[PDB]
Amino acid sequence: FNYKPTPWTRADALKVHSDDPTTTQPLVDVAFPVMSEEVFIWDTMPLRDFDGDIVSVNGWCVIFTLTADRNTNNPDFQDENGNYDIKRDWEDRHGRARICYWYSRTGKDWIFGGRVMAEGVSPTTREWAGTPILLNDEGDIDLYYTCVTPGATIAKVRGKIVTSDEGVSLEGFQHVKSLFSADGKIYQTEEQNAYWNFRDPSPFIDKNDGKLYMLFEGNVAGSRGTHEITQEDMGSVPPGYENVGGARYQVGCIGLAVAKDLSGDEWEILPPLITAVGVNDQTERPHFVFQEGKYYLFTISHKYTFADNLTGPDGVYGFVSNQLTGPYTPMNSSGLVLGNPSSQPFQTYSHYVMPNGLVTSFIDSVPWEGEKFRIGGTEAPTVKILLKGDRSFVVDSFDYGYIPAMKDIILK
Numbered sequence: 001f002n003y004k005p006t007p008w009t010r011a012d013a014l015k016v017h018s019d020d021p022t023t024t025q026p027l028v029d030v031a032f033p034v035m036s037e038e039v040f041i042w043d044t045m046p047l048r049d050f051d052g053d054i055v056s057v058n059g060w061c062v063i064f065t066l067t068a069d070r071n072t073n074n075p076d077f078q079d080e081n082g083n084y085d086i087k088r089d090w091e092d093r094h095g096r097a098r099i100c101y102w103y104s105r106t107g108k109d110w111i112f113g114g115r116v117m118a119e120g121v122s123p124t125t126r127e128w129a130g131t132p133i134l135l136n137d138e139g140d141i142d143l144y145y146t147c148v149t150p151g152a153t154i155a156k157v158r159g160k161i162v163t164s165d166e167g168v169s170l171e172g173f174q175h176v177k178s179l180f181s182a183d184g185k186i187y188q189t190e191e192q193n194a195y196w197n198f199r200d201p202s203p204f205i206d207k208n209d210g211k212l213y214m215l216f217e218g219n220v221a222g223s224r225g226t227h228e229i230t231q232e233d234m235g236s237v238p239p240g241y242e243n244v245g246g247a248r249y250q251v252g253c254i255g256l257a258v259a260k261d262l263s264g265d266e267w268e269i270l271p272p273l274i275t276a277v278g279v280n281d282q283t284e285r286p287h288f289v290f291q292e293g294k295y296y297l298f299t300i301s302h303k304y305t306f307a308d309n310l311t312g313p314d315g316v317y318g319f320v321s322n323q324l325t326g327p328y329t330p331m332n333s334s335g336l337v338l339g340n341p342s343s344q345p346f347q348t349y350s351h352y353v354m355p356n357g358l359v360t361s362f363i364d365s366v367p368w369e370g371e372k373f374r375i376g377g378t379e380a381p382t383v384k385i386l387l388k389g390d391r392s393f394v395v396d397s398f399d400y401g402y403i404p405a406m407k408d409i410i411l412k
């Protein structure tokens with residue numbers, strides 16, 4: 001606990017630039033293909049090891065997805081004229097979220113595997129995002145995920161992957177351990193704020209101290225509307241930029257916890273690494289890339305969760321430090337790493353930057369015709385970025401849902 005969070009300040013957010021082609025996702029084809037007519041996917045969680053490397057097993061790449069049925073022929077998802085309401089179906093998906101797995105030898109053209117957990121295993125019906133960790137070369141996996149409604153609880157469930165020449169099976173994801181919820185002194189609770197953010201575990205082992213940590217999305221503790229916007233939250237804003245409007249309502253942070261030992265069954269909540277008080281309510285899906293001795297800390301956020309008199313695109317923001325606990329500097333001087341183009345501002349979401357520079361996202365909403373839009377619920381084209389010191393550059397584009405492994409684990 002002997003470090004201070006690094007604030008992402010109003011001054012930093014004033015540097016955010018939409019449509020910088022070095023930090024903008026290429027336009028999604030409005031005629032994009034869909035990976036499944038039966039299911040929607042969104043948040044995609046590649047199988048990884050404790051350092052962030054994407055791993056295949058016996059040559060099979062694996063992804064875990066937040067997943068819901070498409071209610072195309074479900075009377076309950078017809079409007080008053082009896083027609084399928086894809087918008088209502090898509091916006092309802094959060095309440096229906098389940099974690100499923102897919103597999104592929106190529107890192108694309110994913111084969112559907114089905115549910116990770118049998119219905120009823122998850123303490124909450126909703127299964128929200130986290131990270132699947134391959135623990136060893138015996139195929140043991142810990143899926144860290146979020147249990148939502150009632151409350152918001154980071155949890156884990158341990159199972160096994162089995163492979164053959166024809167595919168992959170997941171087995172034994174039967175026992176969920178609840179790890180922790182918001183505490184109220186460091187991280188905001190439901191009691192303090194009905195709209196509190198607490199989700200998306202991303203565990204890692206730090207070789208500098210050998211300890212098992214996790215990132216997660218939180219908010220800074222305190223009753224909704226009471227937070228002080230400090231000079232450190234402002235940063236060095238220019239003349240005329242002192243009016244923050246209702247910015248005290250935006251209190252996102254990247255939380256950190258440490259495991260009592262490497263089993264990861266017991267956790268100690270620590271101060272956050274990044275705070276965005278007066279800047280953004282949502283620093284979602286925090287994840288590291290460890291490169292050239294540096295800590296690259298990425299988080300996803302929304303245009304519409306910026307505080308008054310700031311703005312930026314939906315997409316991936318990031319920070320870099322030489323030390324786990326900071327100080328951090330914003331990537332590309334503003335924080336923005338990969339934003340949606342302003343002509344298709346909601347085309348993709350849940351950007352996830354992998355250590356190979358590949359960034360996956362799902363297709364959300366693309367402008368279609370007049371005021372119509374197309375809903376995705378399918379993978380977006382993967383983007384490749386280069387990380388160079390405290391800057392990033394878009395340098396290539398790949399197929400829809402291309403998420404190759406960085407190394408292949410041979411099971412024993």
Ligand SMILES: OC[C@H]1O[C@@](CO)(OC[C@H]2O[C@](O)(CO)[C@@H](O)[C@@H]2O)[C@@H](O)[C@@H]1O
Pocket residue numbers: 030031032033034086373374375376
């Ligand atoms: O009906 C609109 C609704 O359907 C989807 C299904 O993916 O789009 C279908 C729409 O896309 C084309 O196939 C073009 O690619 C059209 O021929 C068809 O009408 C959703 O994306 C959309 O919300």
Ligand SMILES: [Zn+2]
Pocket residue numbers: 049050051052053
């Ligand atoms: Zn590794």
Ligand SMILES: [Zn+2]
Pocket residue numbers: 136137138412
């Ligand atoms: Zn082993």
